[PDB]
């Protein structure tokens, strides 16, 4: 019932496209459809110099 | 290939990358002979005088 954030907006019907830095994972892929990635990335740690 | 067939989520990344041999043994720069800060050298000169 609770899809918080921009994902809920697309699913509910407010917006039919979610152009944004949206990561591709299993949970979202089950409900919405993901296009081919436009940028390959991965989690990393940022620390102060 | 994606126009006549239907691919899936890319499970491995690829691309036109560049391979360059690493420069073994980085040489100390010209200004590597000064471990002392510039204020260090000036203070030493003033003390000598």
**What burial letters (b/e) apply to A15-48, b meaning 16+ CB within 10 Å?**
eeeeeeeeeeeeebeeeeeeeeeeeeeeeeeeee
Q: DSSP readout, B6-40?
A: -----SS------------SPPP-GGGG--S-HHH
Resolution number, Å: 3.6
Do A14 and A6 touch, CB atoms closer than 8 A? no
If we measure between CA atoms, which residue out of A45, A36, A29, A35 comes closest to residue B13?
A36
If we measure between CA atoms, which residue out of A18, A23, A20, A17 comes closest to residue A40?
A23
In chain A, which residues have their Cβ closer than 8 Å to the Cβ of B10?
A: 36-37
Instruction: Find residues 2-41 of chain A whose CB sits inside 8 Å of chain B.
Output: 24, 29, 36-37, 40
* Experimental technique for the deposited model: cryo-EM
Q: How far is CA A2 from CA A5, A25, A44, B23, in A?
A: 9, 18, 28, 54
Distance CA B46, CA B49 (A): 5
Who's near A14: CB < 8 A, 6+ residues apart? none
A37 is in an annotated binding site: no
Q: How many residues does chain A have?
A: 49
């Amino acid at each position: 019932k609770e899809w918080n954030g921009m994902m809920g907006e697309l699913l509910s019907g407010q917006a039919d496209m979610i152009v944004a830095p949206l990561t591709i994972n299993n949970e979202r892929a089950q409900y919405i459809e993901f296009s081919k990635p436009f940028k390959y990335q991965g989690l990393t740690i940022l620390v102060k110099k | 290939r994606s126009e006549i067939v239907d691919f899936s989520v890319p499970f491995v990344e690829t691309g036109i990358s560049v391979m360059v041999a690493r420069s073994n043994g980085t040489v100390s720069p010209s200004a590597f002979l000064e471990p002392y800060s510039p204020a260090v050298w000036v203070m030493m000169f003033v003390m000598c005088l």
